[PDB]
Structure formats: structure tokens, C-alpha cells
Specification:
Elements lengths: L3 E9 L2 E4 L9 E5 H10 L4 E6 H4 L6 H10 L3 E5 L5 H8 L5 E4 L1 H5 L1 H11 L3 E10 L2 E6 L4 E5 H10 L5 E5 L11 H8 L6 E4 L5 H8 L6 E6 L1 H4 L5 H7 L3
Parallel strand pairs: 1-4, 1-12, 4-5, 5-6, 6-7, 7-10, 10-11, 11-12
Antiparallel strand pairs: 1-2, 2-3, 7-8, 8-9
Helix pairs in contact: 1-3
The structure holds the ligand NC(=O)c1ncn([C@@H]2O[C@H](COP(=O)(O)O)[C@@H](O)[C@H]2O)c1NCNCC(O)[C@H](O)[C@H](O)COP(=O)(O)O.
GO biological process, one term: L-tryptophan biosynthetic process
EC number: 5.3.1.16, 5.3.1.24
Keywords: Amino-acid biosynthesis, Aromatic amino acid biosynthesis, Cytoplasm, Histidine biosynthesis, Isomerase, Tryptophan biosynthesis
Length: 244
Amino acid sequence: MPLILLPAVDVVEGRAVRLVQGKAGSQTEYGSAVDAALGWQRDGAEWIHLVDLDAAFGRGSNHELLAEVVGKLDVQVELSGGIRDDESLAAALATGCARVNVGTAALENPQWCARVIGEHGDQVAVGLDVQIIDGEHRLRGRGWETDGGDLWDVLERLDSEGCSRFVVTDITKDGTLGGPNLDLLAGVADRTDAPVIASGGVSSLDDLRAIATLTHRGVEGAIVGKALYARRFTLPQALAAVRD
Ligand SMILES: NC(=O)c1ncn([C@@H]2O[C@H](COP(=O)(O)O)[C@@H](O)[C@H]2O)c1NCNCC(O)[C@H](O)[C@H](O)COP(=O)(O)O
């Protein structure tokens, strides 16, 4: 089965934006979130990775707009950002999205996260936001502002709890067009039976072909942000590339 592509729509104040390594001063803007989402759908997206960046950064919410976007889309939505308790989880799922991602909550409230995993199964994936410094793989929460512990210990815990799916980002590569971290992706995929979704750094069609070589090891999909918005390549080119 080919690598699934998930065009990203990261939302700040109703707008589709990109950042370089999550920094405030690096923001590029690409029109309304709804137009971005419908545009990728028109180009053939099977999935949209829809993120509330304001919620992720704890500075506000785009929930009502995101609910409208999910409602308007025919294709499947992976919704993320600020899902950290029973209210926010239920509100996300009530949009009718295909699944959600929790990130910070896996680091800060492992007990809640385990119970959510146990009751929601395939509708909840966990985002692992990784920073590697001197070979030390650390997780980051709260818009990458906090340390969330050792990647490998947390990965094993979530795997033992029956976590359905992992979304793995190298925060150093995110929004850089510097290429994906194939070693990190393989490392995670080899240490869980759960499918892995690659996120961050894709810069070319060759980058997608490289990720596609990991599909047999557990890398089921790839989230693509900047490369699409910055027009490095088109979605149909990308869809064709993961098959060639
Ligand atoms: N500093 C940040 O950018 C950031 N801070 C938090 N998030 C996201 O918030 C969501 C969970 O929020 P919670 O911590 O659970 O409240 C997770 O999906 C987490 O990745 C962040 N990123 C969310 N956006 C993910 C992408 O970066 C995008 O989906 C593409 O993969 C871009 O990569 P590319 O432009 O290099 O292609």
C-alpha cells in the first residue's frame, strides 16, 4: 500500500500559515484555512492534517472555524491542537473528523492519555514532537516550549498502552525544507507495531520517495506543509511520486 499523503493546514487566526521551526518571527501566510483545505481536496488529497496552532500555543482557539472546515470537506480529517481533556477531546470528535492527535497531554497526563487510548482506539493518535541534542532524543510539549521526557521510554509506554498510531516530527526539520529525518522515522517505526505518520522537513518529490521506502517498516503516511504552500511541487506530482 502506498505512502498516504496528508497536506497540512496549520491555522492561526483563521489563516493557513507556516513557520520555520515553530518560531513566531518566521510566519508565512497563505490565505484562509477553508480555502487551503478545499484547495488540497480539489487537488486529490485523501486526508487533511488540520491543526489549531493558536490552541497548541495556548493563546486562543479556532475551533468553530475548524468545525466548519471538517463539515465542508468530503475527505478525511486528522484534527489536532489543544486536545488535552475530556471536553476538548469530545469537541474535536464532534466535528465529525476521522481522527485526532494528542501531544502535550501524553507528556503531562499519561494516565488520562492511556484511558483515552483505551476507549477511543483508532480515533486517537499521539503526536511525538522530537528534539535531538547530542544524540539525546527528547519530546517537546506546549508548542515545543516544554521538555516532555525521553522519546524511547515514552514511546514504549504508549505502545504498551495500545496507542493506535504515532505522528512523528523532528522539530529541527519542521518548516525548513531541509529534508525529513529518515533515521528518526525508522527508529520509531522499528520500536512499535503501530503505524507511524512522518511530519516535517519534506522539501522535494525525492524526499517523499525516500519516506516511501520506509512504508514496509511501518511508515504509513507523510504530512506535507511548506513544500506544498511554497510550490516546490504539486499534489498530483506527489501522489504519483509515491507510486513510482
Ligand atoms: N511549534 C509548532 O509548530 C507546534 N506546536 C504544537 N504543534 C502541534 O500541536 C498539536 C497538538 O497540540 P497539543 O500539544 O496536544 O495541545 C500537534 O499536532 C503538534 O505537532 C505544532 N505544530 C503543528 N503543526 C505541525 C506541522 O508542522 C505541519 O502539520 C506540517 O507537518 C509542517 O511540516 P513542514 O512544513 O516542514 O512540511
